[PDB]
């Protein structure tokens, strides 16, 4: 139903708008494209984390992120999860 | 912001992933935000290069080909 | 192509083919 395989367009869009100048605009098609990229990003990492042992946990995801070339994300993410649970 | 329930659904599209820890979607919500941010900023480079203020799908296709970290998206948004 | 991602890219091609071969995602959209 699209609501079953993608993040909500407006939420994706809000993140993109924050990334570009205030004067910038984003085409509907580009919002939809990022929508697709983000789903692939989740699935890509998840698939790797799935083959980390043998429950997929936060540590599995963090390692997969390191394995697959997203090492820059690890520390920010650990700091985030820390604030999150505190 | 981003909805955890929906992140979980995406993770659960894969047949092999059956059990997910509660933290895992939280991590993805933030990671997806960081990823959207860097993809968008890299796409914007090409937006400006074509003298536009509107970011388009081809800008994302271009930025994907310029960064080895985005190699996994080549099938998703072909230049 | 990125030596870190190569194997996992191949796997995800096959996973996407399967979901397609079902009806859980479309060919294009």
Author numbering:
A (entry chain B): 53 to 106, 112 to 143
B (entry chain C): 42 to 120
C (entry chain A): 268 to 296
From the paper:
Even though constrained helical interaction motifs generally show a tendency to inhibit PPIs,1a only very few have been reported to directly target transcription factors with sufficient affinity to enable the inhibition of complex assembly.12a, 14 The nuclear transcription factor Y (NF‐Y)15 is a trimeric complex (NF‐YA/B/C) that binds to a particular DNA sequence (CCAAT box), thereby activating genes involved in regulation of the cell cycle and DNA repair. NF‐Y subunits B and C form a stable heterodimer, which by itself does not possess relevant affinity to DNA target sequences (CCAAT box DNA). Only upon availability and binding of the third subunit (NF‐YA) is the transcriptionally active trimeric complex formed and DNA binding occurs with affinity values in the low nanomolar range. In this study, we aimed to inhibit the interaction between the NF‐YB/C heterodimer (light/dark grey) and NF‐YA (green) to prevent transcription‐factor assembly and DNA (blue) binding.
For PBM, we observe well‐defined electron density for all amino acids except G289 and R295, both located in the C‐terminal part of the peptide. The central part of PBM adopts an α‐helical conformation (Y272–A287), which is flanked by extended peptide stretches. To identify the crucial interaction motif within PBM, six truncated sequences (1–6) and PBM were synthesized and fluorescently labeled to determine dissociation constants with the NF‐YB/C dimer using a fluorescence polarization (FP) assay. Initially, we identified a 14‐mer α‐helix with a short extended N‐terminal stretch as the protein fragment crucial for NF‐YB/C binding.
